[model samples]
Target: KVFGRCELAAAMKRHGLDNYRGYSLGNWVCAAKFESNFNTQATNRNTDGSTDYGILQINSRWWCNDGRTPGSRNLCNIPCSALLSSDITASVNCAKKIVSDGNGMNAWVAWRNRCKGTDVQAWIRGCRL
Candidate 1:
């Protein structure tokens, strides 16, 4: 599913992203914008043979078990397929774990490169839920 900016912002906040782990809702929304365009079906293959899945583009190498990432850690303890669900529950939960595990939002390169600064507010400008 493709979510509008406000829609995605509201959803993320509703799922506990408002101020998760020192990162603001804008950071989460903006990372989704760049990582998957807020599309639940989004997936990307990395050069290292791992694949990224869902709106947050979680990687199979360290997060989910894809049965193809070679020595995957599967730290999320969920299948990579779970990340593709439209519900976003698995995605959101896994993301929280990623952040809580000391990686923070920087676990996603899109967050580091595109949503790391104050300008990230642009992603949630009118999405005040």
Candidate 2:
């Protein structure tokens, strides 16, 4: 997929992120590929009626409002165009923050184990981005 620089910049700005210009976008694409195969509309059904949505597989019913706005769950309801635009820095930074703050990349670690059968740090290293 062709990533647009301007859109990525805008997304980064929206989430109050800067200084992640170098490899953040590549990391995001790699994570997205591992998580949802870059499917922005991806959704997973929960035991309850709630649903997770978008590229990051954000749980909308838990973290977002009825309109998909960010909330306690911290998953913003914005479209993929806003999340995956050229300004991918914001999305990556936000995701990093969320993972670091809550689970310390445990979800990513689990995904990496499932997809690549390796450690998270090792998978990150393997990404040329």
Candidate 3:
């Protein structure tokens, strides 16, 4: 969606994902920055040929479909491409589903590797709203 940090933060707050699963907004924002740079259209192929999708980059291996994994477990019942767009509603729903299922941000390696333990507050710094 190419959101400015504050704009994205406000949207996230309004969307009710600010404190999803007890993870801070900064954590998510940081993850988003690394995951897709907030680009809803982002898509990346994994070593296993699975794809991660959207701003949060949910995976095609377990949540969404990229047409390569014919027998993929589409728990979210949404297409991977559904995540690759400006409208974030679908992505939010699927992300919530993922976290509530016991994974939380751990589903995303980007979060663990980059956003985790970092000064995530900086992600929202100057992003007043």
What TM-score does prediction 1 earn?
0.94
Report lDDT (CA) for all predictions: 0.90, 0.46, 0.83
Residues 28-110 of candidate 3: C-alpha lDDT, one tens digit per residue? 78888888888888988888878899989898989987789766789899888898878888888888898788767888788
lDDT of 1 by residue, 1-129 (tens): 998899988889889988899788888988999999889999999999999999999999999999999987898899999999879899999999999987688789988987787588777886667
Between candidates 1 and 2, which one is better according to TM-score? 1
Off by over 4 Å in 2: 1-30, 67-90, 108-112, 115-129
> By how many angstroms RMSD does model 2 differ from the true structure?
6.7
Estimated TM-score per prediction?
0.94, 0.48, 0.92
TM-score of 2: 0.48
Poorly placed runs, candidate 3 (over 4 Å): none
C-alpha displacement of 127 in model 3, angstroms?
2.1
Ranking by lDDT: 1, 3, 2
Quote the lDDT for 17 in model 3: 82
Q: What residue pairs are clashing in model 1?
A: none
